[PDB]
Amino acid sequence: GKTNNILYVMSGQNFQDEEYFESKKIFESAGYKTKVSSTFIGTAQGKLGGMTNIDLLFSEVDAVEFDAVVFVGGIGCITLWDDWRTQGLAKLFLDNQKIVAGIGSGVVIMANAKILEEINVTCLSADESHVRHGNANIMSENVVVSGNIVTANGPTSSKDFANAVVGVLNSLS
Numbered sequence: 001g002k003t004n005n006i007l008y009v010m011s012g013q014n015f016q017d018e019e020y021f022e023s024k025k026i027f028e029s030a031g032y033k034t035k036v037s038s039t040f041i042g043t044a045q046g047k048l049g050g051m052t053n054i055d056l057l058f059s060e061v062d063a064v065e066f067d068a069v070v071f072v073g074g075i076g077c078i079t080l081w082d083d084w085r086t087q088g089l090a091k092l093f094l095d096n097q098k099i100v101a102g103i104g105s106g107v108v109i110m111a112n113a114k115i116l117e118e119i120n121v122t123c124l125s126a127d128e129s130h131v132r133h134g135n136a137n138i139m140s141e142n143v144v145v146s147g148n149i150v151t152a153n154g155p156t157s158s159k160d161f162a163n164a165v166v167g168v169l170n171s172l173s
């Protein structure tokens with residue numbers, strides 16, 4: 001049931017540009033087509049002004065159509081941290097044996113969904129309160145692969161994060 005598709009979950013405004021755009025280029029080059037889910041259908045705009053269109057509402061996501069979900073951070077992500085829909089997607093993908101990945105502030109959604117309890121992760125330095133509150137173990141690394149869970153510590157690690165996600169996906173058929 002491999003699809004060669006990756007889903008992003010991110011805020012429609014003020015998502016972290018580098019985390020999205022730099023990972024997208026790597027995912028595409030590797031043969032993984034990407035879609036964006038958010039809170040409305042239309043044009044999203046990053047913190048730094050970069051635009052992209054939102055393909056899907058969270059409510060329209062079907063896990064069977066994707067191999068992985070990627071939670072993108074940025075200051076706009078804070079609006080999604082306590083949202084039952086984004087947490088619900090984290091759990092949905094985990095329970096369906098998909099890859100669940102987050103970068104920067106996106107990791108907090110995963111922590112709040114209780115999918116990082118006793119799991120080794122990394123995260124944005126500023127967010128370590130939330131991540132530790134979710135019982136995760138914070139590792140001194142830019143990117144951490146823990147089975148099907150992949151985390152990274154923010155925009156400075158966007159390319160390393162994407163490469164790590166591709167590595168996990170390419171080991172699947």
Ligand SMILES: [Cl-]
Binds near residue numbers: 038039085
């Ligand atoms: Cl929705």
Ligand SMILES: [Mg+2]
């Ligand atoms: Mg407990």
Ligand SMILES: [Mg+2]
Binds near residue numbers: 133
């Ligand atoms: Mg709590």
Ligand SMILES: [Mg+2]
Binds near residue numbers: 135136
């Ligand atoms: Mg502990």
